[PDB]
Amino acid sequence: GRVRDFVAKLANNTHQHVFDDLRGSVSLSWVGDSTGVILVLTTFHFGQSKLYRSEDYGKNFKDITDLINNTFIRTEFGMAIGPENSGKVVLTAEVSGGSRGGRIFRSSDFAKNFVQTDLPFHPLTQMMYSPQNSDYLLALSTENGLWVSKNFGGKWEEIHKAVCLAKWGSDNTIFFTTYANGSCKADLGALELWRTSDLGKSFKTIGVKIYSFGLGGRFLFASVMADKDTTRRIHVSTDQGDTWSMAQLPSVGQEQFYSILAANDDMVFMHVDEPGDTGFGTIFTSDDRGIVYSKSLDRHLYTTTGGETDFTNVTSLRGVYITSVLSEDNSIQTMITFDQGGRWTHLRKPENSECDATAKNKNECSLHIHASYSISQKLNVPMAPLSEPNAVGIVIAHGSVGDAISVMVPDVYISDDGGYSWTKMLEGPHYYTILDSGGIIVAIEHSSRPINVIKFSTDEGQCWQTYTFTRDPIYFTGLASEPGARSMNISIWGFTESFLTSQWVSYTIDFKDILERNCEEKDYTIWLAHSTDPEDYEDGCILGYKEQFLRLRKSSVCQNGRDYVVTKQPSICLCSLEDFLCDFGYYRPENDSKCVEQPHLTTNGYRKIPGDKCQGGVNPV
Ligand SMILES: *[C@@H]1O[C@H](CO)[C@@H](O[C@@H]2O[C@H](CO)[C@@H](O)[C@H](O)[C@H]2NC(C)=O)[C@H](O)[C@H]1NC(C)=O
Numbered sequence: 001g002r003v004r005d006f007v008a009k010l011a012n013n014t015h016q017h018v019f020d021d022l023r024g025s026v027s028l029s030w031v032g033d034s035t036g037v038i039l040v041l042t043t044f045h046f047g048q049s050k051l052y053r054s055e056d057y058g059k060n061f062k063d064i065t066d067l068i069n070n071t072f073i074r075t076e077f078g079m080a081i082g083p084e085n086s087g088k089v090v091l092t093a094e095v096s097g098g099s100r101g102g103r104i105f106r107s108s109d110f111a112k113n114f115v116q117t118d119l120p121f122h123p124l125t126q127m128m129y130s131p132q133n134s135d136y137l138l139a140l141s142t143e144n145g146l147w148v149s150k151n152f153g154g155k156w157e158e159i160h161k162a163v164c165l166a167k168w169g170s171d172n173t174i175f176f177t178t179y180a181n182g183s184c185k186a187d188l189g190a191l192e193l194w195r196t197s198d199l200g201k202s203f204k205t206i207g208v209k210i211y212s213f214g215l216g217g218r219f220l221f222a223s224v225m226a227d228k229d230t231t232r233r234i235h236v237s238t239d240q241g242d243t244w245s246m247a248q249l250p251s252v253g254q255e256q257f258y259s260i261l262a263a264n265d266d267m268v269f270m271h272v273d274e275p276g277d278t279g280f281g282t283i284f285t286s287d288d289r290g291i292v293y294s295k296s297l298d299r300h301l302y303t304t305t306g307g308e309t310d311f312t313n314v315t316s317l318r319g320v321y322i323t324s325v326l327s328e329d330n331s332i333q334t335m336i337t338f339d340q341g342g343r344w345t346h347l348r349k350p351e352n353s354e355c356d357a358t359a360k361n362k363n364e365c366s367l368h369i370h371a372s373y374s375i376s377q378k379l380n381v382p383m384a385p386l387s388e389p390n391a392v393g394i395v396i397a398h399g400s401v402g403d404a405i406s407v408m409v410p411d412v413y414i415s416d417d418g419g420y421s422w423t424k425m426l427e428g429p430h431y432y433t434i435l436d437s438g439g440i441i442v443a444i445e446h447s448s449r450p451i452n453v454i455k456f457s458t459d460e461g462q463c464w465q466t467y468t469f470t471r472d473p474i475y476f477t478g479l480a481s482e483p484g485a486r487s488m489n490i491s492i493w494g495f496t497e498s499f500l501t502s503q504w505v506s507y508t509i510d511f512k513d514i515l516e517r518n519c520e521e522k523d524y525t526i527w528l529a530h531s532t533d534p535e536d537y538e539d540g541c542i543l544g545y546k547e548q549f550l551r552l553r554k555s556s557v558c559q560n561g562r563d564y565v566v567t568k569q570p571s572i573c574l575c576s577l578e579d580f581l582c583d584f585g586y587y588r589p590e591n592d593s594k595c596v597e598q599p600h601l602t603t604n605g606y607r608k609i610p611g612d613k614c615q616g617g618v619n620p621v
């Protein structure tokens, strides 16, 4: 049925901490993993800053504002936390205009001690850490210079004087662009692309007539203006610029743009905006070389170059993505693919639901999910779809049933098999979070009035129980939990006011007495992913192979632990003509998978899809 006597267990595991300060903004950062360190930066308007630190996963805080000498901190930059468990933090201060250069506070003890240094310049962007080493930092000044440091901020040196974009690469390699005359705004389309693998000792130009560049996966993209027109194309290199090749994508005008929806180690999603202010574009998918692209989804919804898109990578299950499209009648609709872009289809309606006013036929409708685009329209959608790699097949999102995204108050839906089937979880907008690799899910109401109740479920979203965690209702502001969905601590943030006495508060609840017992070998059951028809001999193998998981049973209340790794067992299907895509100068006509040439590189005509692992069968080569 359900667990009982939970109120007593949770009574002793609730801790309240009240922050005494002026209520301005709040910025929360996690330092490292498994350390439990958190930093809170309160900024307000002269201006003042307060800095708080914890070592207890947010249960207790201490005021370390005296370590930064009570200096004001630019919140626009925020905090520059180092990679991995480096325990490095950098804060940029505000200094008088007459000063020659800026000023930073830098630590390497997980914020236990800070050291003050004066830079010889005025930073224009945020410091960037090298992925390979955390002692390397670069930044651009206000005069468009490029300064690098090999000492973690101790000493800086200038390596170029007219840069306008720089980013790190693998093996401490720096790519940047420089403008010869004027400014990168005025000199756009005539830039250069340089590289230096020695941190400023030698340079090698790897591009001319550049318009922009970007890094994704193991590819390097650069947009180059045409010789005699404003149209620009794309070039891709896998050698860090030693050799280039031209991608097989249509050119764009001056008002259009490109966009890397998602890049992988063996694949990239690309968006190409159609001419005019139509508001939609197209999605292309590449091969493992990043050269040949095939049309994937038409009328993809993309607001503008700095706009919003609903594209989402469902990380719970393999090769599943969700996005929004614009229908012929100008109604926003949602699509889902399970083949990694091979095909797209509408979401399946919940088994027991009724279509809303949007639907024309009450016996025919589908689910539609609110996302970042709906948030951009000032609607009652507090969050976006949520999924974790270590929680298998669990997806939570706000949605409404109908023939298009409705403009009424949404509900919350959950899918326990990657997105094949959905069911209604809760009524009305909520804030949700996954704890302990799917062992517990918590929900908080999203209302305009004070709330003093939290709901949790151990059946993986089937039955819920309420717990009253405070006597004085607060105005909820947001939840906080350690990244990775592997902890059992949840922090609730909010403020309570009576008469000008608003004051931040937070509550931290520990579920260690609910999941008392450790999961055994008898609490896990075998599960087959991507299953559609059990009778079929080859059922459930997507992209050439199938996998079986061991998932915790919904009727077991146990703790997975922080050292949980998902069990798995791939099995390989056979190869068919559906596992290959046409290559270069070929196309695939309608109602057949054959590749026929259009009525120096040369191939047979077929190219295996990136990620396929099929063996034997039919090899059209
Ligand atoms: C979508 O998310 C999934 C899950 O995080 C990504 O799969 C991982 O990809 C990394 C490399 O980026 C691999 O090292 C991991 O082994 C993958 N994890 C798995 C399969 O559980 C996937 O790459 C993402 N897709 C895109 C296009 O970025």
Ligand SMILES: *[C@@H]1O[C@H](CO)[C@@H](O[C@@H]2O[C@H](CO)[C@@H](O)[C@H](O)[C@H]2NC(C)=O)[C@H](O)[C@H]1NC(C)=O
Residues within 6 Å of the ligand: 034, 035, 056, 057, 059, 486, 487, 488, 489, 510, 562
């Ligand atoms: C939830 O927070 C508590 C805060 O006490 C964590 O307990 C600490 O965990 C760290 C892990 O590095 C241990 O070194 C400490 O000794 C623990 N403190 C105490 C007082 O026991 C706890 O680990 C967190 N829970 C989860 C699941 O991560």
Ligand SMILES: *[C@@H]1O[C@H](CO)[C@@H](O)[C@H](O)[C@H]1NC(C)=O
Residues within 6 Å of the ligand: 069
């Ligand atoms: C803090 O700043 C003041 C500014 O007057 C300065 O005199 C003082 O030396 C600083 N303290 C430390 C420990 O650097």
